[PDB]
Amino acid sequence: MKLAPYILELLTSVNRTNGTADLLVPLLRELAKGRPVSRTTLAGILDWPAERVAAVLEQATSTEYDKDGNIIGYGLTLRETSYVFEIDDRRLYAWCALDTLIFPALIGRTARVSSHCAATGAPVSLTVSPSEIQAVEPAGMAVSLVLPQEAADVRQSFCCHVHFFASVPTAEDWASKHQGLEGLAIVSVHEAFGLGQEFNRHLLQTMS
Numbered sequence: 001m002k003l004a005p006y007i008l009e010l011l012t013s014v015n016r017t018n019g020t021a022d023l024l025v026p027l028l029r030e031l032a033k034g035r036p037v038s039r040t041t042l043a044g045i046l047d048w049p050a051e052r053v054a055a056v057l058e059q060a061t062s063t064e065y066d067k068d069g070n071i072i073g074y075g076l077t078l079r080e081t082s083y084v085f086e087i088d089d090r091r092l093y094a095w096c097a098l099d100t101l102i103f104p105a106l107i108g109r110t111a112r113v114s115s116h117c118a119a120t121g122a123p124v125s126l127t128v129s130p131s132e133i134q135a136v137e138p139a140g141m142a143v144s145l146v147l148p149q150e151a152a153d154v155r156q157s158f159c160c161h162v163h164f165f166a167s168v169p170t171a172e173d174w175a176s177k178h179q180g181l182e183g184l185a186i187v188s189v190h191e192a193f194g195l196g197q198e199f200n201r202h203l204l205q206t207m208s
């Protein structure tokens with residue numbers, strides 16, 4: 001549908017803290033290897049002062065850490081979620097449905113994505129490559145969107161309301177019960193993948 005309001009707010013959230021975009025893509029690529037990522041490793045890859053890496057990360061209040069303070073989750077995560085993101089036989093996870101559609105282009109890999117419909121519990125799965133989706137099951141799979149909020153916890157304000165559904169009508173029935181969610185909208189998974197492509201396009205512009 002008319003997804004400009006979502007594109008816009010998603011970008012404002014990345015652009016809100018300088019360096020977030022420059023750090024995101026390298027971190028996603030390293031996490032995609034399936035192992036925890038240290039702050040020092042990230043500094044090395046970015047050629048940034050440690051102080052700089054640390055400031056960006058402190059603004060990203062949903063970031064997940066392990067027992068050593070290594071990064072293990074930033075959209076893409078090693079900690080189990082409802083969104084399975086498998087790349088060459090490494091099972092990783094994503095914070096939400098839209099993340100699984102965005103990451104393949106950013107890490108340059110095709111992913112076997114699977115979840116369950118948030119309305120009915122039905123299995124859903126698809127193959128997401130940098131350019132396209134395939135093997136969409138069910139064909140009519142849908143995604144919920146809400147509007148991102150400034151200075152709100154990203155996982156609790158956005159990611160946790162952005163689900164896969166077995167169909168648009170199934171998703172729309174569900175949405176009619178959750179109209180308190182700001183900007184709640186239902187789109188097809190193809191529309192959501194398109195939204196991810198526009199996000200990624202703008203993101204790569206923001207980068208140095």
Ligand SMILES: [Br-]
Nearest residue numbers: 002003004005
């Ligand atoms: Br609009």
